[PDB]
Design a protein around this nucleic acid. Structure first.
Ligand SMILES: [Mg+2]
Ligand SMILES: [Zn+2]
Ligand SMILES: [Zn+2]
Lengths: 99, 79, 1337
RNA sequence: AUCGGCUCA
DNA sequence: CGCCGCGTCTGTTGAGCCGATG
DNA sequence: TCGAACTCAGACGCGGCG
């Protein structure tokens, strides 16, 4: 099985799973520890934002790849702000300070 | 540096600063439009940057000096 | 957009109205027939947003001209539909309700504030009783709950001077009424009075909470809700089905129930219905809300249609399925694939295979770019079709793109950092990912159906990282311990072992050659045999000079196979590397020596050539196994017949009653074991050397060529025990209980075995299978807890500048060598200068990296204790330095700042856990006997006996290093004298393994005073001999008349005074403890060395040390040195009047005396000395001894459990975990912070280095030190995202919410959540540049 | 989307 | 101070398949 | 709203009672 771009979920905006519906593999927390031990820090920034959740990031990344320039503009994994709204729905004022 | 990246490490000092320096140089070749120094031999920009670092031509201060010169001279020639 | 820190508080009703966009009133969702959102329902388009981009609902205005124009007839703003994800709503409750988390969580945070018990608050809020708010009449008091009955009597007795009511409104009234200043000050002032532990602890907790509310800025009354919020639609969709059915999350259901209850209660409230209807309706509203917050807490969970509980909000964050673990730390990822692996041996170890079409699907956009650049396709659609139709130019372009573009291969589970590596593709046709052979030991992969996953790196930095950090040829030393990780595995070694061996007759015997090349020609033409002894001429290079090579030639005496090998050894190695028969230990040494001398690149080339030639010359021999190879020894009938005769005789003797029950059992198993051993030895004496072959004469014997023996000798597969299974007896088998069954198996796997012999093997087989499948659970769990504790630590500063650390000595003790000094010192850095027995030879500028040469020099001398710099002492705040850690095991030099240290340590300590759950003192070697700090005396016979536990017998070599060490009990007999050379094999210490003597080192009379039998003792005269002594009864039998009098002999002189201890004025009269029954009676002396009285007698270990768990037999220690004393007796347990020499006594509690003690009533001790016996609790060690004591205890114990099974990890990885347990302290004195609150220790050391500087003399506080288990030191940390991410999410989140903390974004997890660059490794420099800019403005 | 059941390393 | 009893909270990781229900 | 649920188990901290 092999995937380069396909469907996406609905409530959390990251790719589906399993061959039956043409999904991408899973990068579980054990691999994240493996990739922190080496010292690589750009690689899992890549695997956390512009290949999974950052919407503007992924569209502009595809643009750059097909355009011949290999670069990256990251944002915020939007399932994080899903988490913000689930917490601040309970009556707790989670909200992130500014500069 | 096609196989092993041992020499450049001693030539700069860290497995990490080498990554940043080589990435910056390969960027300059990728889009900035400069020309390489060591002959191509049908090889990607990344290994070209690694070979330049190994031979002893593209350090960090050399990058700073060279960009400063090009900036000043083009600005002065603007008028 | 950018930010710096994140913050929690409590949310006040004005805030809730500030978030919201419009009230929700009616619970209809959508019309089930027309698919439109109902107005004022849980999906209304008026409140939240449009349904399609730039269109209203009725459909009047459209698409750009009316931007923002709120249409008037349907009432929906004209903007994007990515606003259904962001706008919120709210319900206005008719009556207040109570938040669960701030009520039913542990200590309630309401019951702690008001201070009244929990049960009262439930029974008020369940609508069961009333409560009095404020009585103007002073006969009643606030908060005194009143049931309805006495509520009546109160109603008529006074009536109006009191306020009493029921429900959440009452709790609002109480929570409004009180202040936060005056109670704080009253408790603060009156706390100082009586330090009862209960009072102290309670008042500290109360003060801390009240001060938190005052300081943070919150207000208590906000705990109970009066406006609920509603989260947007797309966060809780309603998905269509095939057939008009709708599947919706449970949230919509939970909201409908509350909406309906609210509307109906409002109705009943308007018309002033009679009281009971209002009561029930309000209680049902309460239940609906606090079932929405989290389902199964207050009562029983409200199930859905299917008898399954519903899914609240508070369980869309918990568990293994919530956000923090299922969806935010591990994403799904695209640009990836997976498949089935298989071998290919034509590769080079920086390559792998890709099937054509997997690589044509992963690298798609690169292909589009190349095509459009070449000009073959004008637009994107042309490229789509040209790629799908698969025209040959696509194959040419694809071969262009993947060149020089590494990919990442991964295999799950990924136990340690060698689990994913970066290879470089080679395109093949097929369906399976080929893979090199040598790198299957690192992955732990076999080729019988495994699967493997492939990712690609996109950008330009990540590609250089996959080339320079994690390629396959860059890491060839494991970071647990610097042992190479490319050992040649199982088939190449047999080829290397079949080439280099010698037969005695073959052909070309004894002719001479001119080089390896003519040896190749001769073997290939068929004029000589592959192994037939010869003498050749060879040319070998040594580089002993100043770094350059020199050549020397000679005639060597070797076979033909070795002269073929010498063609690949790379010009720096001596020829004696090859002259031997190369089992796999020799191959591994060969590779290691190449690595030491010539560097890296020759090692890679050489390892690959070894693989190729091993394969090629192992296939060329043909090496099969056939039923003629399993060779049964000839002398096997006799052995078993003799054993059966012997067991029959023992059975006969038993049936005649001469011998007992168990004795027969033991003798039978012994004789069967002996028969087993000699059968096995006969077998192996027949296999190994029995080929008898003749040449140039009569006969000779050589080692064999039996296929089983070559596969077992060289080291490819198998061992001696398993050949014994196949040919000799297969031993005795054990039954499930654990016992050993009596009659053993007798047949093997060549003769076939019987029925019930098979049915007995099944027991052990299933026990093994069942264990292997139920380790992995808690092994994985332990790895997770370790990685989560050691997470943060990174190497920050260069040199900490601290002073002395810990001291290292060998641990060969007990038996022979366990660990030399070498393996406990390679890598560390010396904490000071180590003097030498040849003095004035100082070796350091106080600190040098002890690499191999220095350990060698230190070996040539005779030093046996060094002091090294350990990471438990380094001072640098928030990290360590680059010298305390020492050598980087993988790279081979000093560690460079920026590594991650916690994660490496936790992975490398939790990875071997899969293999894990599976009298007399004799001198053994000649050497001097040395005893230091020892009290001893020459016995009456003339030999030595000891009167000091402090020293134990150290057997010392002629040089000074301790050869051996033994622990010997008190007063036992010795057969030698101190400080003399003693012959080996000698009983140098002797005592009955039950008997403890009460010898008198002093000389004089022993006379009976203080003891009167029946009071402390009884007269028990030995009826066998006639002489005995007044028997010191045990504490149980000794009566209460003399219970309070210590049974005490008076060691006297001829005059009557107490015998003083020699050299001191301390009287020495034995206050005998129990079982110290003297043998020698009144009027009889006990001189030096004479016995007065004889006193006869897996994985959870590791997961329980690292937990700071407490055992249940606390070996009490000595709190302060000096003489001791006892006191009052047996009120449950006795008391322990400690007797400081110049200090104060009264410290004492109960005593466990139910086990045999050590100290006497009148003995002088040093602090930290045992009293009763048993294991220890580490907290005690930390309290009484320092921090080095506890580190050395932990490291030696865990290292013991590991080393029992031949698993070696280095020692640093134990020390860093401990250094993440001791980071919390409690204060005893005061001066800026509170009295005894727990406190991060780094902040205390920051303060003390500030105020007790020139500014103030002495106000900085004194602090004890504290220890915590890993599952509890992880939770109580500074940041509330690093603690709410794995366990206890609701408790942690609530106690952070009340006190208004703020996270600071410093760890590594805290940054992989929000999507920034890790502060470790490559992402370091920039990440501290950010911090520099945080400070200049 | 949830639940139950069988299977692979 | 010291038993003695009570309600929370934990328990490996990737994949493959098919019924059930709404 | 009757209808089950069962013998997980190991550890820790709190509310009562002496
Ligand atoms: Mg396997
Ligand atoms: Zn409209
Ligand atoms: Zn240090």
């Amino acid at each position: 099985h092999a995937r380069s771009t396909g469907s996406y979920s609905l409530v959390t905006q990251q790719p589906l799973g399993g061959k039956a519906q043409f999904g991408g593999q899973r990068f579980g927390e054990m691999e994240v520890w493996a990739l922190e031990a080496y010292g690589a820090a750009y690689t899992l920034q890549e695997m956390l934002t512009v290949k999974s959740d950052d919407v503007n990031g992924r569209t502009k990344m595809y643009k750059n790849i097909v355009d011949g320039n290999h670069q990256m503009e990251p944002g915020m994994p939007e399932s994080f702000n899903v988490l913000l709204k689930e917490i601040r729905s309970l009556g707790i004022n989670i909200e992130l300070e500014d500069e | 540096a096609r196989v092993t990246v041992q020499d450049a490490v001693e030539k700069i000092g860290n497995r990490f600063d080498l990554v940043l320096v080589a990435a910056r140089r390969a960027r300059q070749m990728q889009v900035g439009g400069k020309d390489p120094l060591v002959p191509e031999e049908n090889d990607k920009t990344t290994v070209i940057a690694l070979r330049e670092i190994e031979e002893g031509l593209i350090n960090n201060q050399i990058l700073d000096v060279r960009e400063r010169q090009e900036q000043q001279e083009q600005e002065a020639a603007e008028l | 957009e950018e930010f710096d820190a994140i913050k929690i508080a409590l949310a006040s009703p004005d805030m809730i109205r500030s978030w919201s966009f419009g009230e929700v009133k009616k619970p209809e969702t959508i019309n089930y027939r027309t698919f439109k959102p109902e107005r004022d329902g849980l999906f209304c388009a008026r409140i939240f947003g449009p349904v399609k981009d730039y269109e209203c609902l009725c459909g009047k205005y459209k698409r750009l001209k009316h931007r923002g124009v709120i249409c008037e007839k349907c009432g929906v703003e004209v903007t994007q539909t990515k606003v259904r994800r962001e706008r919120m709503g709210h319900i206005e409750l008719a009556s207040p309700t109570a938040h669960i988390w701030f009520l039913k969580s542990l200590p309630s945070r309401i019951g702690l504030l008001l201070d009244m018990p929990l049960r009262d608050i439930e029974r008020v809020l369940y609508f069961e009783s009333y409560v009095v708010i404020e009585g103007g009449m002073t006969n009643l008091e606030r908060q005194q709950i009143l049931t309805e009955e006495q509520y009546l009597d109160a109603l008529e007795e006074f009536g109006d001077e009191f306020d009493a009511k029921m429900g959440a409104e009452a709790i609002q009234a109480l929570l409004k009424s009180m202040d936060l200043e005056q109670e704080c000050e009253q408790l603060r002032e009156e706390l100082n009075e009586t330090n009862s532990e209960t009072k102290r602890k309670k008042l500290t907790k109360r003060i801390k909470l009240l001060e938190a509310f005052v300081q943070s800025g919150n207000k208590p009354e906000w705990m109970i809700l009066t406006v609920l919020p509603v989260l947007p639609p797309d966060l809780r969709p309603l998905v269509p089905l095939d057939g008009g059915r709708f599947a919706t999350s449970d949230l919509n259901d939970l909201y409908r129930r509350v909406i309906n209850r609210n509307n109906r209660l409002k109705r009943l409230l308007d018309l002033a219905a009679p009281d009971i209807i209002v009561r029930n309706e309000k209680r049902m509203l309460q239940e609906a809300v606090d079932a929405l917050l989290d389902n199964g807490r207050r009562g029983r969970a409200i199930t859905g249609s299917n008898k399954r509980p519903l899914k609240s909000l508070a369980d869309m964050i918990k568990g293994k399925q919530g956000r923090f673990r299922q969806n935010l730390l591990g994403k799904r990822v695209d640009y990836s694939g997976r498949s089935v692996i298989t071998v290919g041996p034509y590769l080079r170890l920086h390559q792998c295979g890709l099937p054509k079409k997997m690589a044509l699907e992963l690298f798609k956009p690169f292909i589009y770019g190349k095509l459009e650049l070449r000009g073959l396709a004008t637009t994107i659609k042309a490229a789509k079709k040209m790629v799908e139709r698969e025209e040959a130019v696509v194959w040419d372009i694809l071969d262009e793109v993947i060149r020089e573009h590494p990919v990442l291969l991964n295999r799950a589970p990924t136990l340690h950092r060698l689990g994913i590596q970066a290879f470089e593709p080679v395109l093949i046709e097929g369906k399976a990912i080929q893979l090199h052979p040598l790198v299957c030991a690192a992955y732990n992969a076999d080729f019988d159906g495994d699967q493997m996953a492939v990712h690609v790196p996109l950008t330009l930095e990540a590609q250089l990282e996959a080339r320079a950090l994690m390629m396959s040829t860059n890491n060839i030393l494991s970071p647990a311990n610097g042992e190479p990780i490319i050992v040649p595995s199982q088939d190449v070694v047999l080829g290397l072992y079949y080439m280099t061996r010698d037969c005695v007759n073959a052909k070309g015997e004894g002719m001479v050659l001119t080089g390896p090349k003519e040896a190749e020609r001769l073997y290939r033409s068929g004029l000589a045999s592959l192994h037939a002894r010869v003498k050749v001429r060879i040319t070998e290079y040594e580089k002993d000079a100043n770094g350059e090579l020199v050549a020397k030639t000679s005639l060597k005496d070797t076979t033909v196979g070795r002269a073929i090998l010498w063609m690949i050894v790379p010009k720096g190695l001596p020829y004696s590397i090859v002259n031997q028969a190369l089992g796999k230990k020799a191959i591994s040494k060969m590779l290691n020596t190449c690595y030491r001398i010539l560097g890296l690149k020759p090692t890679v080339i050489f390892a690959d050539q070894i693989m190729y030639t091993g394969f090629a010359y192992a296939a060329r021999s043909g090496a099969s196994v056939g039923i003629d190879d399993m060779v049964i020894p000839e002398k096997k009938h006799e052995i078993i017949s003799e054993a059966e005769a012997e067991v029959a005789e023992i059975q006969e003797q038993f049936q005649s009653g001469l011998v007992t029950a168990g004795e027969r059992y033991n003798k039978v198993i012994d004789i069967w074991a002996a028969a087993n051993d000699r059968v096995s030895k006969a077998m192996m004496d027949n296999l190994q050397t029995e080929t008898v072959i003749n040449r140039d004469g009569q006969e000779e014997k050589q080692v064999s060529f039996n296929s089983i023996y070559m596969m077992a000798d060289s080291g490819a597969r198998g061992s001696a025990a398993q050949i014994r299974q196949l040919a000799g007896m297969r031993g005795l088998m054990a039954k499930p209980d654990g016992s050993i069954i009596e009659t053993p198996i007798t047949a093997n796997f060549r003769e076939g075995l019987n029925v019930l012999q098979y049915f007995i093997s099944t027991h052990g087989a299933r026990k093994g299978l069942a264990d292997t499948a139920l380790k992995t659970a808690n092994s994985g769990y332990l790895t997770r807890r370790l990685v989560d504790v050691a997470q943060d630590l990174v190497v920050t500063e260069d040199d900490c500048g601290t002073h002395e650390g810990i001291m290292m000595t060998p641990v060969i003790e007990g038996g022979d060598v366990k660990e030399p000094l070498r393996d406990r010192v390679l890598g560390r850095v010396t904490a000071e200068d180590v003097l030498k027995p040849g003095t004035a030879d100082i070796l350091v500028p106080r600190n040098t990296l002890l690499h191999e040469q220095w350990c060698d020099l230190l070996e040539e001398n005779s030093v046996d204790a060094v002091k090294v710099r350990s990471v438990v002492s380094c001072d640098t705040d928030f990290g360590v330095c680059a010298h305390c850690y020492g050598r980087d095991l993988a790279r081979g030099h000093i560690i460079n700042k920026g590594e991650a240290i916690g994660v490496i340590a936790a992975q490398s300590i939790g990875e071997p856990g899969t293999q894990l759950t599976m009298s007399s003192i004799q001198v053994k070697n000649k050497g001097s006997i040395k005893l230091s700090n020892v009290k001893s005396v020459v016995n009456s016979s003339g030999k030595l006996v000891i009167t000091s536990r402090n020293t134990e017998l150290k057997l010392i070599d002629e040089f000074g290093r301790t050869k051996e060490s033994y622990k010997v009990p008190y007063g036992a007999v010795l057969a030698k004298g101190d400080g003399e050379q003693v012959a080996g094999g000698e009983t140098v210490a002797n005592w009955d393994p039950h008997t403890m003597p009460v010898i008198t080192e002093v000389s004089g009379f022993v006379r009976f005073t203080d003891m009167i039998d029946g009071q402390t003792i009884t007269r028990q005269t030995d009826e066998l001999t006639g002489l005995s002594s007044l028997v010191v009864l045990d504490s149980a039998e000794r009566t209460a008349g003399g219970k309070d009098l210590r049974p005490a002999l008076k060691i006297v002189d001829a005059q009557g005074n107490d015998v003083l201890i020699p050299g001191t004025d301390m009287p020495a009269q034995y206050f005998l403890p129990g079982k110290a029954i003297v043998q020698l009676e009144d009027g009889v002396q006990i001189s030096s060395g004479d016995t007065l009285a004889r006193i006869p007698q897996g994985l959870p270990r590791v997961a329980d040390l690292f937990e700071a768990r407490r055992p249940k037999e606390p070996a009490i220690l000595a709190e302060i040195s000096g003489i001791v004393s006892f006191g009052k007796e047996t009120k449950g347990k006795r008391r322990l009047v400690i007797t400081p020499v110049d200090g104060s006594d009264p410290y004492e509690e109960m005593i466990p005396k139910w086990r045999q003690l050590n100290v006497f009533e009148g003995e002088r001790v040093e602090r930290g000395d045992v009293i009763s016996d048993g294991p220890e609790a580490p907290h005690d060690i930390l309290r009484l001894r320092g921090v080095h004591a506890v580190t050395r205890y932990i490291v030696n114990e865990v290292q013991d459990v590991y080393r029992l099974q031949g698993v070696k990890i280095n020692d640093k990885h134990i020390e860093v975990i401990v250094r993440q347990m001791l980071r919390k302290a409690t204060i005893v004195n005061a001066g800026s912070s509170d009295f005894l609150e727990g406190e991060q220790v780094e902040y205390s050391r920051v303060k003390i280095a500030n105020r007790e500087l020139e500014a103030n003399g002495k106000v900085g506080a004194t602090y004890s030190r504290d220890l915590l288990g890993i599952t509890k030191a992880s939770l109580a940390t500074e940041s509330f995202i690093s603690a709410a991410s794995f366990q206890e999410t609701t408790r942690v989140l609530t106690e952070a919410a009340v006190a208004g903390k703020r996270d600071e974004l410093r760890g590594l997890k805290e940054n992989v959540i929000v999507g920034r660059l890790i502060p470790a490794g490559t992402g370091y420099a920039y990440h501290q540049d950010r911090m520099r800019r945080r400070a200049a403005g």
